[PDB]
């Protein structure tokens, strides 16, 4: 059996390629050949913490030009991963979320207010871009108490523009990288040098201004803990350069993932009417009336069905489509087949595993009730790890799940969603999975 696969979208191409194999195979996608694992029994062996661990994959290695040794792009051996991980964990717990809840909810209010004017003017809204401006402000204001953009305004901050140009310059493949960019001083290399200094200077200013602020009577946020808490083992705090890396990390690793997940959930809510009705009924019962909901921290986790909507969105389209693992020792997965020497790395294809046949014959359908604890217990071997696995799983899972529910609850409570007729779901692949050309229109529910 011969197959022609288009790897223009890499992860979507690997998933189609994986259906002619038995859960593991090889494939050349771009600058490398990768062992792709998309089988339920094989993946859970790869997710074993005693034998395997996180591998800084190719793209993650290329993001080190932007985020350096931040928690997302640092190697396991680098002392700055363990220090930061044991320092920032208390800043991402459920307890720490209640400290941010007010600022998160206030930032959602700012977006809803801006979307009121667009609903009044009967305007089509580019959903991924708007949701990406929101999650940026959510992380920056709740985490660092810093504001980059006003959501009612459409001028873009120079800092966030430089970070995006710096992300594009990092992913540049070795063939598109000129052999002598380090020497000619072209416009692109010079723009990167200027952008890098401008980004480092802005995060240093955020660090210096806070250092002058004693923050009397206020609970410490993410920036405060990085300037206050020392690592219990080594006794040292995160140095200035690493703190600037964590700020850049939380900005890029937290914004795009959460924004595209919200954009996917908005699409499926605007397309399947029964789900939109059941979710809109759950948020109407929690906050009666059409006044903006008085969000209190405990009410967010009580929205069971809206949580099932986000879970099904993260299953059908995991914005983080996969992760790279490496072998801590010489081991074998499966049944003794497939041997791996220490430091050999594979790719866990979550998009293929989440849509795998083990999720039932209706794995391609958006059905939130599937993600209940009882409905999933009736499945057996199946993978659902949208936030990774192990000690290097997503530190911001509780943060993302909190902001994704408040954002969706406010939108469903205040607006109704009109999809674009004739449009069909196309998913582009950047650092994350994103709905391309997704446009919705809103009317105030009155
Ligand atoms: C829908 C939302 C999100 C999804 C699906 C997601 C997904 C993931 C995944 C799959 C990983 C593991 C990467 C790997 O194994 O190579 C990860 C790690 C990480 N995430 Fe996210 N994430 C989300 C939101 C956030 C947010 C809001 C933050 C805020 C700070 C964040 C910060 C991080 C960090 C720092 C790591 C690295 C942790 C470590 O390696 O020690 N993420 N995330
Ligand atoms: C380079 As490593 C083994 O610390 O991911």
Automatic annotation (TrEMBL):
Keywords: Heme, Iron, Metal-binding. It comes from the Viruses. Heme b binds at residues 81, 392, 394. This is Uncharacterized protein.
């Amino acid at each position: 059996d011969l197959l022609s696969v288009d790897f223009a979208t890499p992860v979507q191409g690997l998933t189609r390629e994986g259906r002619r194999h038995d859960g593991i195979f090889e494939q050349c996608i771009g600058d490398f050949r990768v062992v792709v694992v998309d089988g339920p029994e094989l993946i859970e062996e790869i997710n074993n913490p005693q034998l395997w661990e996180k591998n800084v994959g190719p793209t993650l290695h290329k993001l080190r030009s932007v985020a350096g040794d931040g928690m997302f792009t640092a190697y396991n051996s680098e002392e700055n991963w363990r220090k930061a991980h044991e320092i920032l964990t208390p800043a991402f717990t459920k307890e720490a979320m209640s400290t941010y809840h007010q600022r998160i909810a206030a930032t959602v209010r700012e977006l809803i207010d801006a979307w009121n004017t667009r609903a009044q003017n009967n305007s089509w809204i580019d959903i991924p871009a708007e949701t990406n401006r929101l999650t940026i402000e959510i992380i920056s204001r709740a985490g660092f108490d810093y504001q980059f953009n006003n959501l009612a305004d459409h001028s873009e901050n120079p800092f966030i523009t430089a970070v995006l140009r710096e992300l594009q310059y990092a992913n540049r493949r070795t063939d598109s990288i000129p052999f002598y960019e380090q020497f000619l001083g072209g416009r692109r290399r010079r723009l990167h040098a200027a952008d890098k200094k401008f980004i480092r200077a802005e995060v240093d200013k955020i660090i210096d201004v806070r250092r002058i602020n004693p923050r009397v009577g206020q609970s410490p946020d993410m920036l405060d803990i990085m300037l206050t808490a020392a690592d219990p083992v080594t006794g040292d705090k995160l140095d200035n350069n690493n703190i600037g890396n964590q700020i850049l990390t939380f900005l890029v690793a937290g914004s795009e993932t959460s924004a595209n997940a919200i954009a996917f959930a908005l699409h499926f809510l605007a397309t399947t009417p029964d789900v939109a009705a059941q979710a809109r009924a759950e948020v109407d019962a929690m906050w009666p009336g059409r006044t903006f909901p008085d969000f209190q921290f405990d009410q967010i986790a009580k929205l069971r069905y809206l949580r099932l909507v986000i879970d099904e969105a993260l299953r059908l389209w995991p914005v983080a489509p996969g992760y790279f693992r490496q072998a801590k020792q010489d081991t074998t997965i499966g049944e003794g087949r497939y041997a791996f020497k220490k430091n050999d790395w594979v790719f866990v294809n979550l998009h293929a595993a989440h849509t795998h046949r083990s999720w039932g014959p209706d794995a391609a359908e958006f059905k939130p009730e599937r993600m209940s604890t009882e409905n999933r217990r009736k499945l057996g071997p199946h993978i659902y790890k949208p936030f990774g696995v192990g000690e290097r799983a997503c530190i911001g899972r509780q943060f993302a799940q909190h902001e994704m529910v408040i954002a969706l609850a406010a939108i469903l409570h205040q607006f109704e969603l009109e999809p674009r007729p004739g449009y069909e779901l196309k998913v582009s692949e950047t650092l994350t999975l994103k709905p391309s050309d997704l446009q919705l229109r809103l009317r105030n529910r009155v």
